[PDB]
Amino acid sequence: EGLRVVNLLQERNMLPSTPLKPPVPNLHEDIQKLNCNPELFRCTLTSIPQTQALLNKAKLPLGLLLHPFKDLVQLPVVTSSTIVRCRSCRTYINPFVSFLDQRRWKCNLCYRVNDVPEEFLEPHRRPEVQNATIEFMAPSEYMLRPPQPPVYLFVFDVSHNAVETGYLNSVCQSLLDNLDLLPGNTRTKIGFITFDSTIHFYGLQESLSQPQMLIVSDIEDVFIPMPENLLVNLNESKELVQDLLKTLPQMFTKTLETQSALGPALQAAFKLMSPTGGRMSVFQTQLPTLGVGALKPREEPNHRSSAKMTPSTDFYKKLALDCSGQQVAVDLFLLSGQYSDLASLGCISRYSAGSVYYYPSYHHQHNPVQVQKLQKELQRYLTRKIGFEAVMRIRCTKGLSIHTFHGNFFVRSTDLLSLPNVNPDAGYAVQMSVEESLTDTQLVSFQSALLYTSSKGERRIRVHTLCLPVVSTLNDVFLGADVQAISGLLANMAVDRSMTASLSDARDALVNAVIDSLSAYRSSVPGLMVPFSLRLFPLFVLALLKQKSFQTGTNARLDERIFAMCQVKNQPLVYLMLTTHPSLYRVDNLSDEGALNISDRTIPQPPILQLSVEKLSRDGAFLMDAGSVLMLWVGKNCTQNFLSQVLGVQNYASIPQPMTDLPELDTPESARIIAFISWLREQRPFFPILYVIADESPMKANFLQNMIEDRTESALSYYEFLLHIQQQVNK
Amino acid sequence: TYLEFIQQNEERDGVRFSWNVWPSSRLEATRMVVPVAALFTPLKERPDLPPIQYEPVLCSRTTCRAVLNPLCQVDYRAKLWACNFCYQRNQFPPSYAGISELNQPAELLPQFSSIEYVVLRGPQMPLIFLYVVDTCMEDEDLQALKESMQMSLSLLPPTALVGLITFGRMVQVHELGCEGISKSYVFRGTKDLSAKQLQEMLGPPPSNRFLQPVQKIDMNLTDLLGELQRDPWPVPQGKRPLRSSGVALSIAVGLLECTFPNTGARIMMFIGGPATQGPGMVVGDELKTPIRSWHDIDKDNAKYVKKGTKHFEALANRAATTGHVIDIYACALDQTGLLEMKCCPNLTGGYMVMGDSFNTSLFKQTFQRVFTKDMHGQFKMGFGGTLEIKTSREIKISGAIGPCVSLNSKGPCVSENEIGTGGTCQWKICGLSPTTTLAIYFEVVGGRGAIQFVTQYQHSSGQRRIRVTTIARNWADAQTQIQNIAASFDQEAAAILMARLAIYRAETEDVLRWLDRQLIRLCQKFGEYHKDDPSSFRFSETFSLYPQFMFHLRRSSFLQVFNNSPDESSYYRHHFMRQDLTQSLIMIQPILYAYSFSGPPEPVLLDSSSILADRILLMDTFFQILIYHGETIAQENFRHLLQAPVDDAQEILHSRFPMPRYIDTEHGGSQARFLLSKVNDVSLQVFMDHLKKLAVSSA
Amino acid sequence: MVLLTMIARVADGLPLAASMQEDDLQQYQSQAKQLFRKLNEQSPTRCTLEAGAMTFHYIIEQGVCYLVLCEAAFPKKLAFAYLEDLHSEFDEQHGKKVPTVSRPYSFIEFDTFIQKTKKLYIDSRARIMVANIEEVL
Ligand SMILES: O=C(O)CCCc1ccccc1
Ligand SMILES: [Zn+2]
Ligand SMILES: [Zn+2]
């Protein structure tokens, strides 16, 4: 429904009311129906340029975004006694091969003909060829050692500042609540370390009256104090670890330890886990200042400082590489109230296939939002599935070459990705180029394959295969453009540009990506003319430039920006888009146009509004879905039926200041809004907390920081942006 | 009676001299064959002397400052006294204003020549007990050791501070009483730490997190001590466990050195085997290689001794400088490394206990005798003792041999010729008991030469106390010089004082050659004989036993180290260098009693002629009590005989601090070898014959 | 006097259970898998192999091979007693399911008994054929 040209200056309402859907590659009906799910695997250009010259002319980035370990509704599991792989490039037999003789099949990635084994027998009816997504049982040769058990090591900061935050109490409560839900079988092991100026191990034996806290004080020469009972069998010693999790928050109440030796503690935790590998959960609340890996204090910027990022040491990168070589992933939970040099601390999770979680100014009493946020994210972190000791390879048809990888992993050699852990909430991105002109073929394929040890001790391979057509026309490259995927790839490219160059250059290359592509489009066709597929391209790039990752004139602090870049590099495409351009709905007047399909529930389907205060109304209420949170903004002149029947209040003034969630009142207006909210959080596995706190006077209504179309004192509006682009397009 | 004199003076003043009449000239002082020396017991017990709760009066002369003693000339009219050492005349302190000749102070009555004062000024420090426990030992030995320490915990004063350090491959410094968690600081038993290092890594009456009062902590310590388990590290096949004895001790030393320096503390180390790792290593971890023997050390096949000895020697000096006691309780079938660790209990006043296993009556009883109390419920131990000796201007101190350390104090009483720990008027004894006996060696450079012993120490109560013993001995009369000297000779005391010299030179290397040249010399100066006529030689009743004491000393296990293990030789010499006269004579010449129908028990000669077939013998080596049954008796009247020595054995098998090993053997039994080796150049008869041949011939 | 333990089906060398701890493993794990491939129905049921400073010990019961590696100094008397303890337990718990599985390490959870048994032989406190392994390979 769109081969048209669009004048961005005249529309100014181009964002649709219903959710954006990924493009359908221009493929034959029977080929496209077997194509990979676009949630798991997608491409910036669904029509692959035939030559690098054509790609360069379009001035659009070519690359793939993937979410390979995503939780699936249904997964085919082939237990074949033999894995059919192309004898040349080791590509797994996928739906987009070319069966000819029928005893012979042509590899869709390197064109070599292979012999179908007398095990695969109608060979085209085999499930390996009917499913673009499939999981294989790896044979004995796909593992370097016996499948490793599940090993969970929790490392807690217990300094004076950490004890003041009160985080330890809820984390220990989450572990107690989710002990039986940790993934694993009877082989599961679990350990614990606390640290401040010294490193504290905890032995757990059934022969002793109580756990034993073994303190290594030699910060410059850490070692393991006991050989057996530090990492304990959770099944056998369940009672012993429960007593510890109930006793741990009470041990450091009166602590004067002001310094934190995070470096040596991580070296201690590495040595403890080195023999087996597994998941290291680190909880840090302040700047590391003692021993090796110490980081200096920095003064936070203000709205006035210009664009003048990188780590201050390589200690945590080196330590991550050592963890990677031993199948250890490190997840960093930073609950800091002051600058902590996350630009250096993050290196522990980027290069070890971990993930960083940031809770700014966490406090058990003062910050109820960050309390419930951590509780829900810990619920997901502790119960989601997990794979150990894994590697991933990204293959693409001959002629296409991957040259840059984005995400949390270590790139091992030419193309091999080390994933000490793999988690279902991780996103990856790749940039590619046309190394050899695709004159021969009219389709090209892409295959990702994840070899991993399951929590039950079984080597598995999850394989996704994507197939796309090849075009040789500039207009055909534009007709297949995926605006969101291009936005995702440009965000990852802009993060790398910031580290590498500066935030100015990262911001400029982002603006230039829009100017250059639309300037190229204009030079091959008065106002600002764009193809239909790119009518949201300046909108999403502007949203990128106002996001906390790349914004300039804001009062943003260092660790906030770094954590926003960590989320760019590690989140799937959907949540990058939900964060950058949140979905805004009006919710004080919901009705029946909804999805009332679901048996007994009618779910309202209000239209998506564009991110501008001009769309708000003091007479109503507006819910903003930012992916991780759901901020419900209430107007001052809000109706009375909404206050009493939805909020449970008699007037605007008595709406509680921090409101952690809506009530579930016996009103149909409440039933409607609870139906819409619960439907929103069912669309994701990461439970997003909803705080209606955003109010006129909450002073937490950064809700407005997401109105990316309005001008601020230090950024352009959306219309100002279109005006600047057009001036540059036809300069 | 000179014997009554020797008895009463040791009973009153806890001292015994080689000569009680001293050379009044320079021509006899240089020509003394056995030096003027004293076996001095600074804390000897006696018939309830009155404690003197006033400050002792001191002479008002910067250099001298001796204590008011019965040898001081007083003038109750002028309220003045003249110091007997420096002739300085002193005014009496105000509290002595009501003094009179009729009622005069205690320290002037000759009865209180030895007197004790109590100084009450400063608040008393609590006692400190640091347990240092090896965990590399069999379960039955560790369980027994755990019970022994829990028992001693129930005897400590409620004020005392306790700490616990366990070790094996690593060293654990336990922080006591920490709620529901039990923690400790773990260190590598691989590298040494200094006190300053240890202090940084770790951190109304005083107490640490690591040293807490018994009354507040005893319940958590007895539960910890009850849950101590063996070192968790596995021992692979053909290997010894990795035992970090040297670093655990240096952490116990350094801990107290940076928490309570200069106050009575007891580091009690319990060893189940040798140090196999780290500084202070005694042997490797390969079971193929045995622990060194005397034969190995003579043929230079003991690569750990000197380096390991040097490590514990520096720990001994660190602890002795800080004023702390180091005990060593070692029980194992193999050797333990006492040869390398001897300086720690030797230089301090530390005990050294040696057995086969902690799970024996021998160790369990010996360990609780450490905590024997007196008539007030207080331990018979003192701490941080300082011995200073004032001599007449004619007397100089060569040095001391025994459990002490020099304070390197210079004064005119210090002699050029030093002996043992010499060159000082002051010595520190970090731990002492009513038994601790030093040997002080003097030198002469109306009558009466005087010596004053002043011992300041910390009592088990916490009270600071000063023991003052002032003795006087007559100067020789010029017209009867050597005749009076020869009559005042204490042959037992001089034998032990000469033995102290021989063992000190052996343990710090021939020694028998010096021992004989002095026996021959003593025979010529004080013996009766015609020249070149060996049969003419006799000795006074004053000297007759000295050659026999020399015969047994030169054949004893104190100087013939082979046929014993190095740990046993260092153990034997440890206790001889500490004991009083009576016990020292027992060590060198074991006592022997005979038991038969023909008469009640009677002492007999240490000769093969005393071993009869129809007689039961009781040999009291100080280290072992042995009962021998002749070939006939080995099979109500036969019961009285069979248990007569057992009854007499039990009595002495309890007073002795290191409970001696008990042995019931008979003719043909393997254990009869201990009797046959102490009994009998060669024999005493031949030894005597060769001695007389050289005494009557050239000088 | 250390360890590497592997239990595998003799017919195809299919791994059933194993146990390894380091803090190389790569070379001797290959040789172990080489041996599982060579072993068949004519192989010695009990054997010992010499590999320099190392030494393999195995038994074979009900088409299942129980292999253990250790330093050559480890008592060969003890190595076989450790394999008998595993076999009688494994054959009692999984002996009847062995000829039906097809996944590698279908008995990973036998990890637990292996290591609790392993510790009862690598601590002096607790207390056939010979051929150079390079030949058979
Ligand atoms: O070298 C290889 O690619 C095979 C090993 C790594 C891998 C396994 C499974 C899927 C993809 C990669
Ligand atoms: Zn191929
Ligand atoms: Zn005087």
Residue numbers in the entry:
A (entry chain B): 346 to 466, 476 to 662, 666 to 882, 888 to 1093
B (entry chain A): 3 to 205, 223 to 464, 474 to 537, 541 to 666, 679 to 723, 746 to 764
C (entry chain C): 1 to 23, 29 to 132, 148 to 157
Sentences from the paper on this structure:
The packaging of cargo transmembrane proteins into COPII-coated vesicles entails a direct interaction between COPII protein and cytoplasmically-oriented ER export signals. About a half dozen export signals have been identified to date, almost all comprising short peptide motifs, all of them binding to the Sec24 subunit of the COPII inner coat. The ΦC export signal was identified in studies of p24-family and ERGIC-53 proteins, and comprises a C-terminal signature of a pair of hydrophobic residues or a single terminal valine residue. The ΦC motif contacts a site on Sec24a that is also the binding site for the LxxLE- and DxE-class export motifs.
Notably, 4-PBA has a structural formula that resembles the cytoplasmic ER export signal of p24 proteins—one or two C-terminal hydrophobic residues, termed the ΦC motif. As an initial test of the hypothesis that 4-PBA targets the COPII coat, crystals of Sec23a/Sec24a•Sec22b were equilibrated with solutions containing 4-PBA at concentrations of 1, 15 and 50 mM. Difference Fourier maps calculated from X-ray diffraction data show clear evidence for binding of 4-PBA to the B site of Sec24a. (F–I) Residual (Fo-Fc) electron density (2.8 Å resolution, 2.3 σ contour, no phase bias) at the B site for crystals soaked in 4-PBA at the indicated concentrations. In summary, the crystallographic result gives evidence that 4-PBA binds the COPII coat at relevant concentrations of the small molecule.
